[PDB]
Design a binder for this molecule. Sequence first.
Ligand SMILES: Nc1nc2c(ncn2[C@@H]2O[C@H](COP(=O)(O)OP(=O)(O)O)[C@@H](O)[C@H]2O)c(=O)[nH]1
Ligand SMILES: [Mg+2]
Lengths: 82, 181
Amino acid sequence: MPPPADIVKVAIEWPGAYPKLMEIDQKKPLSAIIKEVCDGWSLANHEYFALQHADSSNFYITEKNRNEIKNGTILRLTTSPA
Amino acid sequence: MQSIKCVVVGDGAVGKTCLLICYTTNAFPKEYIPTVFDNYSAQSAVDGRTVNLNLWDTAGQEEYDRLRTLSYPQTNVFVICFSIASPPSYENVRHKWHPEVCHHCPDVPILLVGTKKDLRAQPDTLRRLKEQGQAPITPQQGQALAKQIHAVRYLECSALQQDGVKEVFAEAVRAVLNPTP
Ligand SMILES: Nc1nc2c(ncn2[C@@H]2O[C@H](COP(=O)(O)OP(=O)(O)O)[C@@H](O)[C@H]2O)c(=O)[nH]1
Ligand SMILES: [Mg+2]
């Protein structure tokens, strides 16, 4: 019942680049978060990218599940499925 | 100026967070909170020169092993802490922390730091360690470990007393700017 945190700490990997440790503003759209992540790696066209769990689940992160991310979760930048 | 990435590692509860918060804010944390990761900054005069320190706090728990190693790329110096009041954390320098940082960042300089020196002669700590068949780490033991792992230096501090904290990060800077063979 208690509400989720409005800020969460995560690490994001992008194969071949150095990883990014950041705090996600959960009130900011996920697309803006991805744009910030992409900007750091000299990547444009952020709407062609997605965040997905780096661990064995490999679930994609969405607006509807981003509330379930705990502090310390490792994510991977990837191409959006669709 | 000149910036330097410094990552602080060691067992849970050895005093990494209090070390960093005392150095960067001159305040001692009121409540223990497990660290996930934190990036602090400091600008310090070191041997007549102004340097920027990009400081990283880490989670010492095995649960966050992979997360912690994602903070290691491009590190210029590691500060490996053990608590003087916890000999198990000293042994984990040999078994976990020194091998892990060298695996990920070959040849990066290491400063070895014994924390919580204010507890070394506290009767209650001495009594609790004695019931565990133990005693606080001695300075000579700290030097011996530094020698064993090829640390640039062994230093002791008490973040609680604000004793020796400035000198840890000045020596960390010197490990990068004035490399020793
Ligand atoms: N007596 C004493 N206690 C300390 C010192 N530094 C940290 N502590 C305590 O040790 C516990 C763990 O400290 P913390 O800095 O959070 O350790 P971390 O888990 O390595 O980040 C906390 O209860 C701190 O108040 C110190 O210099 N002296
Ligand atoms: Mg901590």
